């Protein structure tokens, strides 16, 4: 308690001396309360015209027009100690888990260098604006290095002074840049050296791409087993035990010297402790501490989140297997059955799973799995939407498993080869392309942010009629040679001057570990789409009325556009289609 929390509590109240306050009418149950202290502020999400402009007939529809319109009661909730024979079971697997990721690699300290460069080509970093303007600017100013140095020394000795949340089925906690260079310091390499990679990791999937997911599921779906099993849990993040924060600490055994009492800090500190600054309308300050749930950097967090759940997965697959009776706990005998079961058949277990952080698909031995619940439900991985105990359903098709937001088809090439390319909704993908955050946009950054959507859709829902040709109809309205741009940054191919059918031949022909037959595609008209029938299920408006005069009219559409940027060198890219090649 307080002791750990105190020095970075006592900093801010001296900041805020003339507005310091106990209130009696806190809302906070499950939150440590200690004050509250004068603010007042506070970004809403704004509409790309250049792509809205492309997609007329989405216009009418409410689906796609309400995406652009607009639980902090999960946040205040609280998770039971898990059971004993749940404790054991997790601390073993733990233990085991990071052995096999640490086989090959290395821990290492990420750099200030390595942080600079990130810095200086947007990552969403979540840091905060206040002595600076931007984090860019911060990087270069070698007072900043002093302040990291004070609290870095502070960290060797066992204290924090600065590291201090700001909270924002969503909660992003933005800490000030320094705090998040101590993160990236002692955590980064999990990320940056690629722990969850598929090769490293067997069930991870980091840096695969939305086209390799559908093969790597296809890959699973060819196991022995049961059915495909894809729970998410209910506000995965507030279900974090310190029970977890402890097993994923034991990454720090792994480490050495300076790096190990550096990510030892960092979890004691920021993750197994935690300072928070929330806002209340009531507009004050409030300063919370609480020890469990996640709360770190959104990169950090997808790692230990994806640790985590292999973890789960792995013991929810003992539990169908039976290879232990009981959570309330486990038997000396039981213990080395365990051990023993992840020596024998861990390794295979983890290759029949696919984990991206909190979501999951799981091939189990066989369908003991769906009704297997007391150490998930006492580990506090609740499902979503599904009574505690009723057992899940699977899947029968790994063409129908839901992951990453997506679905898979597999689509047979005029020449007999097999693409396995991902879907979505067509009103969530048209929806997402039309919306911008930020504020200061220039008509060049919104046609450059339009175009990288246009890049995507083309190089990974080529297979869907109406996304081609508004990806044509976008590229043929914005100036061929203006560079695709993002501003919160998986693999993306799409972000490239280069021509996408080249894009499209490496990504799917020459680099595709599936595909056997390197043969070019020659065109884009050798390229196939899904079924009519199968477009029309996945939110096709082909067929339409509306749709129809969209297509015909199209080089209108793109006129108007052209004329509003105005006079600039365009290519016209919508005669790589049949209809429009004459
Ligand atoms: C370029 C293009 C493609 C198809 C169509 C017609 C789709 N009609 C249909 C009927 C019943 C089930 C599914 C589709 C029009 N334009
Ligand atoms: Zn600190
Ligand atoms: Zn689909």
Same mark, same amino acid.
């Given at each position: 308690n307080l002791d750990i929390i105190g020095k970075r509590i006592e900093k801010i109240k001296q900041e805020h001396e003339t507005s310091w306050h106990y209130d009696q009418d806190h809302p906070y149950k499950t939150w440590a309360y200690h004050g509250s202290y004068e603010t007042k502020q506070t970004a809403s999400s704004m509409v790309n015209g250049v792509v809205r402009l492309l997609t007329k007939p989405w216009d009418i529809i409410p689906m796609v027009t309400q995406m652009a319109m607009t639980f902090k009661e999960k946040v205040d909730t609280r998770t039971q100690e898990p059971k004993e024979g749940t404790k054991k079971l997790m601390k073993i697997t733990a233990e085991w888990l990071w052995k096999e990721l640490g086989k090959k690699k290395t821990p290492r300290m990420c750099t200030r260098e390595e942080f600079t460069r990130k810095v200086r080509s947007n990552a969403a970093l979540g840091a905060i604006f206040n002595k600076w303007k931007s984090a860019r600017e911060a990087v270069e100013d070698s007072g900043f290095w002093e302040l990291v140095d004070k609290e870095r020394n502070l960290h060797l000795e066992g204290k924090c002074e600065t590291c201090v949340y700001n909270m924002m089925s969503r909660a992003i906690w933005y800490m000030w840049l320094g705090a998040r260079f101590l993160e990236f310091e002692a955590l980064g390499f999990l990320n940056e050296d690629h722990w969850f990679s598929r090769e490293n990791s067997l069930s991870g999937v980091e840096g695969e791409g939305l086209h390799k997911l559908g093969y790597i599921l296809r890959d699973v779906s060819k196991k022995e087993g049961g059915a495909m099993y894809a729970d998410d849990t209910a506000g995965?993040?507030? @279900?974090?035990?310190?029970? !977890?924060?402890? $097993?994923?600490?034991?990454?720090? $055994?792994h480490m050495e010297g300076e790096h190990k009492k550096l990510a030892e800090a960092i979890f004691k500190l920021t993750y197994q402790n935690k300072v928070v600054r929330v806002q209340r309308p009531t507009t004050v300050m409030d300063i919370i501490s609480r020890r469990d749930q996640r709360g770190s950097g959104q990169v950090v967090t997808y790692g230990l989140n994806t640790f985590t759940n292999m973890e789960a997965q792995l013991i929810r697959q003992m539990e169908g297997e039976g290879v232990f009776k009981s959570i309330q706990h486990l038997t000396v005998t039981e213990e080395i059955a365990v051990? $023993?079961?992840?020596?024998?058949? %861990?390794?295979? @277990?983890?290759? @029949?799973?696919?984990?991206? %952080?909190?979501?999951?698909?799981?091939?189990?031995? !066989? !369908?003991?799995?769906?009704?297997?619940?007391?150490?998930? $439900?006492?580990?506090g991985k609740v499902r979503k939407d599904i009574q505690q105990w009723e057992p899940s359903r699977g899947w029968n098709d790994w063409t129908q498993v839901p992951f990453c937001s997506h679905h898979f088809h597999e689509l047979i090439m005029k020449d007999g080869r097999v693409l396995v390319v991902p879907c979505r909704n067509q009103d969530e993908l048209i929806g997402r392309a039309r919306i911008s955050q930020g504020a200061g946009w220039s008509l060049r950054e919104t046609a450059c942010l339009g175009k990288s959507y246009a890049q995507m859709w083309s190089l990974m829902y080529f297979h869907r009629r109406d996304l081609r040709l508004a990806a044509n109809a976008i590229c043929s309205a914005v100036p061929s040679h203006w560079v695709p741009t993002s501003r919160t940054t998986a693999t993306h191919e799409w972000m490239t001057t280069e021509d996408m059918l080249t894009v499209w031949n490496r990504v799917w022909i020459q680099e595709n570990p599936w595909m056997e037959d390197k043969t070019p595609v020659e065109s884009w008209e050798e390229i196939p789409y899904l079924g009519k029938r199968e477009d029309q299920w996945c939110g096709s408006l082909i067929g339409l009325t509306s749709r129809a005069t969209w297509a015909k009219n199209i080089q209108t559409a793109i006129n108007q556009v052209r004329s509003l940027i105005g006079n600039e060198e365009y290519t016209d890219y919508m005669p790589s289609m049949k209809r429009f090649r004459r």
């Open positions: 995965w993040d507030t @279900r974090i035990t310190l029970e !977890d924060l402890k $097993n994923e600490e034991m990454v720090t $055994n051990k $023993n079961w992840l020596v024998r058949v %861990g390794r295979e @277990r983890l290759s @029949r799973m696919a984990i991206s %952080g909190d979501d999951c698909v799981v091939k189990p031995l !066989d !369908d003991r799995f769906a009704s297997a619940l007391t150490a998930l $439900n006492d580990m």
